[PDB]
Design a protein around this motif. Sequence first.
Motif, PDB file in Angstrom:
ATOM      1  N   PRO D 137      66.740 -97.999  15.776  1.00  0.00           N
ATOM      2  CA  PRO D 137      67.374 -98.503  14.548  1.00  0.00           C
ATOM      3  C   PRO D 137      68.913 -98.843  14.632  1.00  0.00           C
ATOM      4  O   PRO D 137      69.650 -98.792  15.811  1.00  0.00           O
ATOM      5  N   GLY D 138      69.494 -99.232  13.540  1.00  0.00           N
ATOM      6  CA  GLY D 138      70.851 -99.935  13.490  1.00  0.00           C
ATOM      7  C   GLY D 138      70.744-101.441  13.015  1.00  0.00           C
ATOM      8  O   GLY D 138      71.476-101.650  12.577  1.00  0.00           O
ATOM      9  N   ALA D 139      69.736-102.227  13.262  1.00  0.00           N
ATOM     10  CA  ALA D 139      69.583-103.547  12.658  1.00  0.00           C
ATOM     11  C   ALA D 139      68.360-103.169  11.820  1.00  0.00           C
ATOM     12  O   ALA D 139      67.794-101.971  11.877  1.00  0.00           O
ATOM     13  N   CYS D 167      54.290 -96.430  25.399  1.00  0.00           N
ATOM     14  CA  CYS D 167      55.113 -95.346  25.389  1.00  0.00           C
ATOM     15  C   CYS D 167      56.267 -95.520  24.451  1.00  0.00           C
ATOM     16  O   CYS D 167      57.202 -96.590  24.913  1.00  0.00           O
ATOM     17  N   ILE D 168      56.663 -94.733  23.520  1.00  0.00           N
ATOM     18  CA  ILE D 168      57.704 -94.744  22.440  1.00  0.00           C
ATOM     19  C   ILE D 168      58.708 -93.755  23.199  1.00  0.00           C
ATOM     20  O   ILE D 168      58.209 -92.331  22.809  1.00  0.00           O
ATOM     21  N   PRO D 169      59.697 -94.155  23.777  1.00  0.00           N
ATOM     22  CA  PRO D 169      60.573 -92.880  24.440  1.00  0.00           C
ATOM     23  C   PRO D 169      61.560 -92.244  23.214  1.00  0.00           C
ATOM     24  O   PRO D 169      61.746 -92.867  22.258  1.00  0.00           O
ATOM     25  N   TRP D 170      62.090 -91.217  23.610  1.00  0.00           N
ATOM     26  CA  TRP D 170      63.284 -90.418  22.672  1.00  0.00           C
ATOM     27  C   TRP D 170      64.406 -91.110  23.037  1.00  0.00           C
ATOM     28  O   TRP D 170      65.034 -90.856  23.948  1.00  0.00           O
ATOM     29  N   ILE D 171      64.912 -92.033  22.138  1.00  0.00           N
ATOM     30  CA  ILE D 171      66.156 -92.557  22.162  1.00  0.00           C
ATOM     31  C   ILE D 171      66.848 -92.050  20.663  1.00  0.00           C
ATOM     32  O   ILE D 171      66.606 -92.915  19.553  1.00  0.00           O
ATOM     33  N   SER D 172      67.514 -91.175  20.584  1.00  0.00           N
ATOM     34  CA  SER D 172      68.075 -90.357  19.592  1.00  0.00           C
ATOM     35  C   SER D 172      69.499 -89.954  19.874  1.00  0.00           C
ATOM     36  O   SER D 172      69.809 -89.543  21.016  1.00  0.00           O
ATOM     37  N   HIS D 175      69.163 -84.192  19.246  1.00  0.00           N
ATOM     38  CA  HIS D 175      67.979 -83.687  20.092  1.00  0.00           C
ATOM     39  C   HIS D 175      66.821 -83.701  19.199  1.00  0.00           C
ATOM     40  O   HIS D 175      65.636 -83.538  19.695  1.00  0.00           O
ATOM     41  N   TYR D 176      66.985 -83.412  17.842  1.00  0.00           N
ATOM     42  CA  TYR D 176      65.752 -83.264  16.990  1.00  0.00           C
ATOM     43  C   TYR D 176      65.809 -84.285  15.832  1.00  0.00           C
ATOM     44  O   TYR D 176      67.046 -84.770  15.480  1.00  0.00           O
ATOM     45  N   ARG D 177      64.836 -84.556  15.174  1.00  0.00           N
ATOM     46  CA  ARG D 177      64.579 -85.285  13.896  1.00  0.00           C
ATOM     47  C   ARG D 177      63.929 -84.690  12.950  1.00  0.00           C
ATOM     48  O   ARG D 177      63.025 -84.047  13.277  1.00  0.00           O
ATOM     49  N   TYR D 178      64.298 -84.918  11.602  1.00  0.00           N
ATOM     50  CA  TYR D 178      63.517 -84.275  10.437  1.00  0.00           C
ATOM     51  C   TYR D 178      62.280 -84.997  10.442  1.00  0.00           C
ATOM     52  O   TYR D 178      62.224 -86.205  10.554  1.00  0.00           O
ATOM     53  N   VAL D 179      61.259 -84.324  10.029  1.00  0.00           N
ATOM     54  CA  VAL D 179      59.928 -84.609   9.894  1.00  0.00           C
ATOM     55  C   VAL D 179      59.848 -85.403   8.238  1.00  0.00           C
ATOM     56  O   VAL D 179      59.292 -86.422   8.419  1.00  0.00           O
ATOM     57  N   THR D 180      60.548 -85.002   7.603  1.00  0.00           N
ATOM     58  CA  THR D 180      60.636 -85.447   6.194  1.00  0.00           C
ATOM     59  C   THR D 180      61.745 -86.910   6.289  1.00  0.00           C
ATOM     60  O   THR D 180      62.207 -86.806   7.248  1.00  0.00           O
ATOM     61  N   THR D 185      68.508 -89.425  10.647  1.00  0.00           N
ATOM     62  CA  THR D 185      67.591 -89.181  11.475  1.00  0.00           C
ATOM     63  C   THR D 185      66.456 -90.359  11.532  1.00  0.00           C
ATOM     64  O   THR D 185      65.485 -90.208  11.491  1.00  0.00           O
ATOM     65  N   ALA D 186      67.018 -91.693  11.460  1.00  0.00           N
ATOM     66  CA  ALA D 186      65.987 -92.942  11.617  1.00  0.00           C
ATOM     67  C   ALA D 186      65.496 -93.000  12.832  1.00  0.00           C
ATOM     68  O   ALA D 186      65.948 -92.665  13.821  1.00  0.00           O
ATOM     69  N   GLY D 187      64.256 -93.454  12.988  1.00  0.00           N
ATOM     70  CA  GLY D 187      63.443 -93.676  14.281  1.00  0.00           C
ATOM     71  C   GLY D 187      63.345 -95.062  15.050  1.00  0.00           C
ATOM     72  O   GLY D 187      63.311 -95.097  15.965  1.00  0.00           O
ATOM     73  N   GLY D 188      63.327 -95.855  13.997  1.00  0.00           N
ATOM     74  CA  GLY D 188      62.843 -97.125  14.595  1.00  0.00           C
ATOM     75  C   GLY D 188      61.881 -97.910  13.981  1.00  0.00           C
ATOM     76  O   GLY D 188      61.013 -97.377  13.008  1.00  0.00           O
TER      77      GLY D 188
END
Lengths: 57, 57, 57, 238, 60, 60, 125, 256, 79, 79, 269, 269, 269
Positions: D137-139, D167-172, D175-180, D185-188
């Motif tokens: 995320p970011g753009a 494979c989508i790696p953990w780039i955060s 350490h954790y992201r909300y399921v809601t 906590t944007a994922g991409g």
Amino acid sequence: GAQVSTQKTGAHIHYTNINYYKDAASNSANRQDFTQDPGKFTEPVKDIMIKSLPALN
Amino acid sequence: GAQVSTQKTGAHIHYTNINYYKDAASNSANRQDFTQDPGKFTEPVKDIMIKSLPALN
Amino acid sequence: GAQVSTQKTGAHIHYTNINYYKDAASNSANRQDFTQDPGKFTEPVKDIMIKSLPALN
Amino acid sequence: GLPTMNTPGSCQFLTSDDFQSPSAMPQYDVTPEMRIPGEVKNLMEIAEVDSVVPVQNVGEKVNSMEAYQIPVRSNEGSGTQVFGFPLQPGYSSVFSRTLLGEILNYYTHWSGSIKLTFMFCGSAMATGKFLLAYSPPGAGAPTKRVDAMLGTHVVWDVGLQSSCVLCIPWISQTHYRYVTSDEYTAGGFITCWYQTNIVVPADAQSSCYIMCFVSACNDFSVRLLKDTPFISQQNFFQ
Amino acid sequence: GLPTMNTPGSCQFLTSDDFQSPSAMPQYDVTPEMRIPGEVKNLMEIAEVDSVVPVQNVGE
Amino acid sequence: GLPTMNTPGSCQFLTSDDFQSPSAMPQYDVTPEMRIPGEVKNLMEIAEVDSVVPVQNVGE
Amino acid sequence: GYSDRARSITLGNSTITTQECANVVVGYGVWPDYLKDSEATAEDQPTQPDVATCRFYTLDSVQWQKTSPGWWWKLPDALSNLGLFGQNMQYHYLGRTGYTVHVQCNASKFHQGCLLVVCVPEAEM
Amino acid sequence: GYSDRARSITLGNSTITTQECANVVVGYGVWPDYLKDSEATAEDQPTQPDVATCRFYTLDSVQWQKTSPGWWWKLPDALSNLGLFGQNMQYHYLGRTGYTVHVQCNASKFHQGCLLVVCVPEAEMGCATLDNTPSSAELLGGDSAKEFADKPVASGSNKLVQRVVYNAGMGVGVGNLTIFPHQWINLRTNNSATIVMPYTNSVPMDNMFRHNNVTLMVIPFVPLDYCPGSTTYVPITVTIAPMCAEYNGLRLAGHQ
Amino acid sequence: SITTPEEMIEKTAYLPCKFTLSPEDQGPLDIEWLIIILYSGVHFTSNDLKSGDASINVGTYQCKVKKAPGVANKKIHLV
Amino acid sequence: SITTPEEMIEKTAYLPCKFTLSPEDQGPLDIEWLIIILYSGVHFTSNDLKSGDASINVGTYQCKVKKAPGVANKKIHLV
Amino acid sequence: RVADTVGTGPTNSEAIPALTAAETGHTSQVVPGDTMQTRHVKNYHSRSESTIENFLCRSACVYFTEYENSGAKRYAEWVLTPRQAAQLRRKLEFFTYVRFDLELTFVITSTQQPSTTQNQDAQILTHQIMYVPPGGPVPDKVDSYVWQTSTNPSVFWTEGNAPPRMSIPFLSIGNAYSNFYDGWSEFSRNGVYGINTLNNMGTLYARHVNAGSTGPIKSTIRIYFKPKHVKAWIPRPPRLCQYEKAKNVNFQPSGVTTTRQSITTMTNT
Amino acid sequence: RVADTVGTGPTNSEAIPALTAAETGHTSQVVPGDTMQTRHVKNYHSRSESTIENFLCRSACVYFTEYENSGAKRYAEWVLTPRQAAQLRRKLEFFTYVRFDLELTFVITSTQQPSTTQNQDAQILTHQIMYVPPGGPVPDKVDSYVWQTSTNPSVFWTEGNAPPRMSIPFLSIGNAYSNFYDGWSEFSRNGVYGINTLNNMGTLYARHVNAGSTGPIKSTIRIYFKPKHVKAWIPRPPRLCQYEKAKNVNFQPSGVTTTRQSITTMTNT
Amino acid sequence: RVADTVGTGPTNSEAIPALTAAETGHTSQVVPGDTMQTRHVKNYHSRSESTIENFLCRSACVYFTEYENSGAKRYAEWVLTPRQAAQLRRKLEFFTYVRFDLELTFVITSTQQPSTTQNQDAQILTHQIMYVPPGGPVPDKVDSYVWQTSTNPSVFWTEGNAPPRMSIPFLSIGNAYSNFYDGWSEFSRNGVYGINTLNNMGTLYARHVNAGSTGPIKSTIRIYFKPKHVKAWIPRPPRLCQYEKAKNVNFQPSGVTTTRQSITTMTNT
């Protein structure tokens, strides 16, 4: 598995403790941590400063 | 007949337990079983599959 | 003066007990007595009877 | 009598307490254990298994098997988009009902990498090349293949092996992201583009489908068990 | 039942008591610790730092 | 006073509990045991004995 | 047991897989490297972006027709406006790099044709 | 030097050879066996027919069309009238067995489509009428495949089955049926599918007429598609072999 | 539990009310039909109705089968 | 949370009511304007108002955004 | 402990981890460092809250019911079962066969009912809860002799105290409980389908021991199950549809999932 | 132990401890015996009550709210946060980042409300407190099925007993909590400022399980936080101004300090 | 542990385990593998719940009775005996002679009685339970001096607390208790038959210590026996008929068992 520690006493005795639960967030507060290090906020200079010497020379 | 075990703690302590009843269905839940074996549901093939090798040749 | 015994468990653990009173009629029930002897009510004959042999000869 | 003092919390019912209680059937002998296949000890052994993703969940496609089919064809061009959805494993309607998504909706948090497997289901003659892309995320989301080319991508060439894994790696930052849903906590974004056109001979179908499977990697974990927003009730079932 | 006697102070809430209580989330794994600069362990490490005095605190 | 916490189930009467209670006659001396024939320790020693079956249980 | 036709190349955050490849041609037998101390002349410390600059960039696609003569691309110009490779050549006076070029064209068995893919040094026209 | 695509399976007096197979899926990693002395409860001596019961039985064929929703078969019911397996479950009160299921569908390169072959334990299904329960005739087809529906079934005081394909008759997502042992028949890559299932129950043996331990489902996720001039009739054939079959409780033949 | 507790009989009309008793059920058995006939410790077709046949021989007809603690009902539309 | 919950629009008048939903918020979404229009499961300018735009196109106009447990309000003085 | 990321660099070879055959029935075991360059990241995460025990071992309301100290309803009855509620039923049915002990809790409350009676002073109320195993006599009235509880377990409880709580072991005649049963209890295959006697756990009865007052009062009991010492086998797909009955799996057909605007839309419509 | 005074005599030298440069950013470390003659004084004082633990580890009322057994307000809700009150907020915000477990206590009380209803005899009241983690379903009514608490933690409590108390661990997705956040949750920089999801701790719901009486009653719940096992980083200047909002740091400009009469006045005017 | 099945094959011999003589008074000890072919089945079953202790060691209501705080019935009395109830009596009489300690529990409850009295506010009630051994003075009134309990055991109990509970040992003058007595207490053989003094355990008295209120209240006490540390001798046939009296074994003649339709009917008629 009992822990024997020293109580807060005056200047110039022990107590016993056992943990009952499994999570360690259930334990009592740590009230006997008397560690100090004020040299981060105070005197945070790159070169050390002696007391008797002039600060700038 | 006391049992001393380790509590759940963070990364980067013990507790004591005694059983009072006689049936063992009266005991507390087993919350520290961290055993895993996903290879039954996943990768359940008769011939083993290496990652770098083509699945079918 | 603690007594450690085994709990009832399934097939295919201990518990601790201390007595508080002085009379022994105050104690808990004896639930683990697994002694059997059915040969009084059953097969109560003076001469022993073998299974494969005729009862009367 | 040994002198005692009762502390706050006495005689309360906390539905997640762990205490010993008296048995109402003393000395009951239980049925012995037999060996049954397929024993589970962790819900993350179920999350690590593939399941088919409904990417085409548009309109009446959901009440059909067409939700699971991703259509592809032969174009007079190149670089057009095939699909796109966000990295929201438990909130996005693309993932929320998959085996991973159902398990995630019992927990507040999630962490780890994800595996998306794409399988071609056209004629053997049909040939194609596809670009599978992930943007952190970011753009915004990419609107063109060249914009998507700048992120984490795989160029999938179709041939003997019909399945490719992205494979989508953990780039955060955390350490954790909300399921809601949550913008902190944007994922991409996850997109697909036509690297080269689908090419067929005469008498073969120029329209094909692709299938997608979502599974968790071996660094995945969840936290904070909670109730699901998926099952409800108005009266006692009979 | 072990015979016991409850003393005065039972079932009271004293806001500065130090007891063990049951956790409402069993077996929750917390976020590990990272190293952050400027950690405090005693309010007297803050008191020992200078700060400017308003001596001319008169009127406006 | 040793600090304690009472859990659910306190002060309830479950008719199949197994606890120690105070005796209302302290130090009472019971009558000694004599040896009697036919002592039972398990109801399955009685079940293992024959008994006549009423197969013709029809009408009167 | 595998097939020499299937090859995978991974660079930075990108990875290309081909199920039908002849092999890889390596320059003049020379794998790219960095400039060594005994071959340099400029004295300031260089910058090496690595994963940020060394990664696959995909260009526009051309259409192969029955009458197409051919196409050409100047490598430095081709990526002059693409990402941090472009930014780094914009802010710097000297650069140095090698390449991995992958050309892609699929078709069915019936389709026929042959293309020459060549990397020509100093293609002065 | 051989090809992992070619496999041969021999059981009793039968043998199946496939030149295009993905591999074999093995249950939950468990090869079928006989019941052991420390796991049994019934005391009479069991019977083990072996070669007579453990062998491949081939069922009727179904036609894969462009609009076919899918088919299902209760394993115990499927072979209830076939040979000595059927006779032995007719004369006995308890039985126990595993399976080898082989699904077959060939087509040319042009033909496209993908089928999911899954062995689902305790595939308990639901009736169209909410108060009623599905009829035995509707739930079971001994010598014939049972068909799914695409449209929802109408509930009017009947004992039909909600055979909706996207709910798999069990009111669950059809894409999540992958937890169960399964394989995919993809016409461009695959030709056949094979699963070896062990005995799965909460009891050591069971009566084989009032309980179906496992159900075989074949569901096309991608439809069948061909251009004109290609073959239009494409069948699917199912072949099943019981494994380590044992029987207890001999009495007069019949189920009542 | 009554078998097929919802059905429509279109037509002597035989109304089936075959039922099953849970191990828990142990109370007295009471059978009632509604629109008419009651059984306690139109004509019932089975002499041994206690075994599990509460069928009767003749709007909506409701069969109520009650053995504590179990309670079951069956609605039949006779046309 | 509504962005700029206090502003004066001096002038078709566009009244902005863009809002954000906390992870805690999970109740049904209800939008109300006051002085006029109500949204439940003057004209709203956004077809996808659920995403977070409760703006409308036309004293003090109040926008009330309610998703349990969160409650937010915005007052705009239209001159 | 969960796995830790391994650091990798660039590659050019015939190794192809990203290409496979999903027709085999096998889930690919690829790490991120198979398709990109990765750093070394030690991972301290733990899958402790995902164990079947922690996932299932919380108390849950499964049923509640009322009774009065006067009038027709003097006592309550309920056949023990967890299928009446939605939440624990859906969690339990992640699996085919389960095996657990039970922890049982009760929350009993009372409310004064409207009436014209005057000078009402109420004494404290004691309640009796009695469990009858399947096969035993059941109470036809509040004063029935069966309340003698000579063998049946009973729990007496007075308003104002802690909730009553007891432990029940695994009572199934079969080796494991069954969440699903594809069959009939009749060899003929006639009769009710999906019904068997493996998970029968008896009935619960509740009453006032005294009436307490000269005015009307109504009590409610709420029952809570907590599974302990759990074992489970054969994972199953989660329930997509809304439960309709307690006795069977009947349902109404529902869409595979929610619908968006198009296949490239990044929002939920 | 605090430091002990060292004895010194007279001096005449080039050593200059009293002269320095405060421009360096360094606090001088001069003892009294650097500028006067001193005796030897052993010091037995201890800085035990100035530790961050003792300073923060006391229970504090952070919120209270009401509900009734009849009428529109049958249940209460509150998003957990310590910024609603002044005292604990001001103590916590001595630092930028904190990390602690929580001890939670409740004080629930009830009062009879005025009415014309007659013959009112009230039964004992039981209350339910339910915590919903962020993302889960919330109760639209007092009788909502979500009160089943299959997974959500719940605490049942009857009037007259001890207050309920539970322990909550560190729940932040980030390594440490944040008292201050200079930024936005939107990359565009639009939207609300100073707001993030690092310190979201879910919502609290409270209700009567029974109504108890035929007349009206109103309950109040008071929530108490006690931080345990504390860690803190980056000291910050204390809040000079009166808090205005819970969500942000907005304030009204206030004088640096109080005003006296002149620069030589020894009293406060 | 219960016995385990032994595996056997086919036989042809002069060994005849299936043939015997039941006239001997001996129960045949044949296993299944004596008349059929059997497999080897290890048996893990246990006869733990069939022990005389577990079979008898549950609390059982044996009697209950009432008294009031005003009016003629101010106190209650009862001669201790387990023959008044049906269930424990029938379990105990499986044997001829028993020997056990007793655990005694009481459940006391109170109810407000209808009256025209007004402004009734009731204080808490305390009850006294007094055991008089056989031979001692008994209370002629509620205020009788014998309630001084100088030697007689007494238990005071206030409404709202746990039930009172005490342990009583084996008090028989004879070595063992007697469930049956074929004889008379008179050497002449005249007088009552089946009556002796071996199982006399004294009387129980119950009263209110205070009246509590100005309006009428009625209390009930329920007594519970639990046998402990049991010994039993000489097994006896179970009671086929319905008990009629507490003092003797009198009965009404009843059919050996239930009746079916014929000797080949597989159902119960």
